[PDB]
Structures are given as C-alpha cells and as structure tokens.
C-alpha cells in the first residue's frame, strides 16, 4: 500500500520545525483567518452601524478599547456569509454589517477543532496517551457555550461577546447586572476550579523547587538536571513530610498528583460552561425566593444579597439605552434609580 | 450597622441568611479606623451592633 | 451454573473515601441554599 | 422564611445516597483478604 494517500501522509507527517499533519489542513487556515480577522478588524474596522461605537486604531481607539464587535440585533443569528443575502458579495458593506464577527467566531471554532485534532494526531505519532487533547475539551466547552450557544439562545449574535479587551469587560458587567451571574453555583464551581488550579500550579512548582536534590556544585541549580536521567530530581518523601506537618495532609502518589492537576481546572471550566448554557435561556440563579418574600414584607430586613440586587438594577437602567440601541430606550431622568445625592 | 447610618445589615444564618447570603459584616463607618476591641464597648450588645466581631476576626 | 470469568473485584481506598466524602459534602454545602431557595 | 419544602429531603438524599455508596465500597475493600 503506497498510493497517493500514503505519499501525502508521509509528507504531512515529516519531522519539520512546524509540524503539519492531516489536522493541519483544518487548523492552519482557520486559526490564521481568525487571528488575521481580529487584527484586521481592530486596526481598521468600525462598529458605528452595528453598535454606534468606534472600535479600531484607525478611529482613535487603543489596544484596550479596540474590538471586532458583534452584528446589529436586526441581523438575528445570520451566518452573515460574505456571499449571503445581507452583504451580497460586497466586502465593505460586509465589514459595516459585522461580518467579521461571525467570520472570526466560525473560523475560530473550526480552528479549535483543528487544534484538538492536532493534539490527538501528535500524541498518536509519538506514542503517548492523549490526555492533553482530553484536557483541551474544557477550552472547547467554554468557547462553544459562550460564543455560540449563549447568543443562539438570546435574540441575536449582538449579545455574544465582542472580541476586544474593554468589550469583554462590558460582557462581564452585563452578566452581573442582568444575570446576577456571580450568584450562580456553576460559576462558583468554575471560580474554584480556576483559582484552585492556579493554587496547584504555584504550590507544585514551588514544592518541587524547594525539595531539590543537590545534583551539582552551582548555587544556580538549573544545570544540575539532565532530561535523560532516571532519578527523581526532587524528594517526594521530604515534600510529603513537610506538607503533612504544615497542612495536615499531603500527596504521596505522583501519578495521582498530576492527574488531579488535570482534573481541577478542567472540571471547573466545564461547570462554568453549563451555567452559561442556562443563561442562554435567561435560566438564571437570579434570586432566593424566601429572601424576596421576607424583604417585601419587612422594610428593616437587609442582607448583602438584597444590597447586590440594587446594584444590578442600577447597572440595567444606566447601561441599557446605550448598550442596547436597537430598543430605542428613552428613560427620562425622573425614572432613573439613584440613592441620595449621587 | 456597617455604614454607620443606623441601618443594620443581617449576616448570620439564624437572622435570615443562607450559606450564599450569610457573612460576618464589617465594623461601623462611625468607627472608621479606630481600634474597637471588646473592652472598648459598654456591652456585648453594643459590640455586636457596631461590628466588633469583624475586627476581632 | 458455571461461574462467570469476567467478574472482577472492586476497590475504594481510604484516601478515595475521604476525597469522595469531601466532594459530596462540599457540593451539598454549596447547592443546599438553592434547594431551599 | 418561606423556603422550598422539598429542600430538606433534597439536601438529605443528595448527601446520603452518594456518601453511602462510597462507604459500602470502602468497607468491602478493607474486608478483602490482605
């Protein structure tokens, strides 16, 4: 068996500086177009006709404020293809209608698929187990739930996150004010997985570096390691005693330790994804009913929970007219919620 | 009374909170940065109204 | 009847017991507020 | 407070059912031949 397919497979799997692979055929153009689309938009392209915002270096934005913004709410969930019925093949109009947003979201999605396929392909060639790809399932679930499922549940792509620093900050604040997203136990598990993962990263790196064996004469200890060496470079036994005596418990099994390092942040991200799927439908953890019944009846009952809801109400009333221009909100001064003086 | 305006905020389980809403509440704005140990209060009831536990903790 | 040769013993070590109980109890401490609503 | 009346048994079984599963598995491991 040495036909054109096998010859191609040979070329695709050459050991070169940048490995290609069959997965490369999907991954390279899609990742390139997504990145190039973002750079192109943030440098040159407005959001005047979709959002009423300037969004590019060309208009005077900086790195923090540039974005490729979502299409107008009136576009619905249009794929907004360049040759589609909205832009009708007109590149300029396509940019003005927000076509770069779906360009980037879709090429980005297919590129992420390509990258996970790359993780599988390389693992298979090299003869290792595919846990890196498996762990990548968490980035996939986040991207798909946030940039795709979420706006698909809402009225249109307009409410997806826009690709920009400040734009993303706005997304966070929208979620606080409208969804009370910090109250959601799926977000809370996400937070624990992220902060716990960061904790594990720090503590494991630090522990290894402070239980090193002296394997050289240098006071800078990095050179006293050889990639081909059979011996552990640090003492698990000493590490175990230290942590047992400091914290009460300690790892004793290195395999379990590293598995756990995969488990914690990967599971956290998956949990946050589930919460966002509910938010696509406005299925929020917004309230505690018992709290509201009590507070409604008793004007002296106050908790941090009720205090945060008043903040959410402020966010909604003060941000909506400019953040949701298609609604044509006109909120007269007298109806705006405000405490004393401010 | 976290903000020193005689508007007490409930933080404990027995006083209407669950695990998510519950808190030990910061000491009063009337206190500011003044040191407020138990023995500065006329009584424990006073100490508690003004948020003494927050500082101790 | 002839015995089944596919049977395998099952195990849960003490550490795994402690980790599992911690997971369950913490999940309960977290979700209980929402079950009471 | 007007809580959900099923909250108590929901929480109780949420804790008890998997905890018991784990306890069963642990004890039968301990009793296996050393």
């Amino acid at each position: 068996e040495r036909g054109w397919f096998d010859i191609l497979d040979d070329w695709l799997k050459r050991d070169r500086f940048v490995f290609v692979g069959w997965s490369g055929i999907l991954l390279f153009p899609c990742a390139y177009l997504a990145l190039g689309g973002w750079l192109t938009g943030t440098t040159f392209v407005t959001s005047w006709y979709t959002h009423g915002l300037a969004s590019s270096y060309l208009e005077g934005c900086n790195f923090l404020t540039v974005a490729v913004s979502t299409p107008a709410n009136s576009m619905g969930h249009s794929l907004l293809l360049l040759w589609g019925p909205e832009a009708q093949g007109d590149f300029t109009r396509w940019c003005q209608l927000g076509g770069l947003w779906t360009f980037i979201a879709l090429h980005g999605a297919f590129g992420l698929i390509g990258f996970m396929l790359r993780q599988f392909e390389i693992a298979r060639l090299v003869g290792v187990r595919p846990y890196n790809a498996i762990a990548f399932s968490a980035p996939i679930a986040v991207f798909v739930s946030v940039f795709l499922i979420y706006p698909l549940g809402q009225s249109s792509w307009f409410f997806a996150p826009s690709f920009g620093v400040a734009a993303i900050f706005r997304f966070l604040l929208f979620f606080q004010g409208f969804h009370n997203w910090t109250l959601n136990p799926f977000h809370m598990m996400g937070v624990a997985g992220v902060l716990g993962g960061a904790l594990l990263c720090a503590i494991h790196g630090a522990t290894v570096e402070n239980t090193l064996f002296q394997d050289g004469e240098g006071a800078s200890t990095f050179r006293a390691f050889n990639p081909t060496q059979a011996e552990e470079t640090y003492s698990m036994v000493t590490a175990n005693r230290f942590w047992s005596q400091i914290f009460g418990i300690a790892f004793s099994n290195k395999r379990w330790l590293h598995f756990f390092m995969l488990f914690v942040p990967v599971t956290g991200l998956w949990m946050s994804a589930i919460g966002v799927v509910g938010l696509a439908l406005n299925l929020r953890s917004y309230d505690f009913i018992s709290q509201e019944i009590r507070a409604a009846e008793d004007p002296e009952f106050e908790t941090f929970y009720t205090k945060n809801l008043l903040l959410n109400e402020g966010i909604r009333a003060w941000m909506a007219p400019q953040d949701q221009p298609h609604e044509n909100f006109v909120f007269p001064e007298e109806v705006l919620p405000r405490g004393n003086a401010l | 009374d976290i903000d020193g305006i005689r508007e007490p905020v409930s933080g404990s389980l027995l006083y209407g909170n669950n695990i998510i809403t519950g808190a030990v509440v910061p000491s009063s704005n009337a206190i500011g940065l003044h040191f407020y140990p138990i023995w500065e209060a006329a009584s424990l009831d006073e100490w508690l109204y003004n948020g003494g536990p927050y500082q101790l903790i | 009847m002839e015995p089944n040769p596919n049977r395998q013993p099952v195990e849960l070590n003490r550490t795994s017991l402690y980790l599992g109980l911690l997971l369950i109890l913490v999940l309960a401490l977290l979700f209980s507020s929402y079950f009471f609503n | 407070m007007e809580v959900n009346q099923l909250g108590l048994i929901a929480t109780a079984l949420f804790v008890l059912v998997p905890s018991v599963f784990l306890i069963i598995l642990y004890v039968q491991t301990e009793s296996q031949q050393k």
């Binding site: 009460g248 | 027995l14 | 402690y18 109890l25 009471f36 | 108590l8």
Partner: peptide, 30 residues
C-alpha cells in the same frame, strides 16, 4: 431546619478533616 442543615453539613466537614488528618492511611516507603 435550613440553619440546622447548613450547620450539620459544616460540622460533618470538620469531622472529616479530623479523620483525614489523624486517621489517614500512613504513607509508606516501599
């Protein structure tokens, strides 16, 4: 009953800490 439930779960957690620390399977060098 809510308060009792919260405090009970918490108490079980603290007990679990105790067993996990003082009645752990001892690590052994083979």
């Amino acid at each position: 009953m809510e308060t009792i439930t919260y405090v009970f779960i918490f108490a079980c957690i603290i007990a679990l800490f105790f067993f996990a620390i003082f009645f752990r399977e001892p690590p052994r060098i083979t």
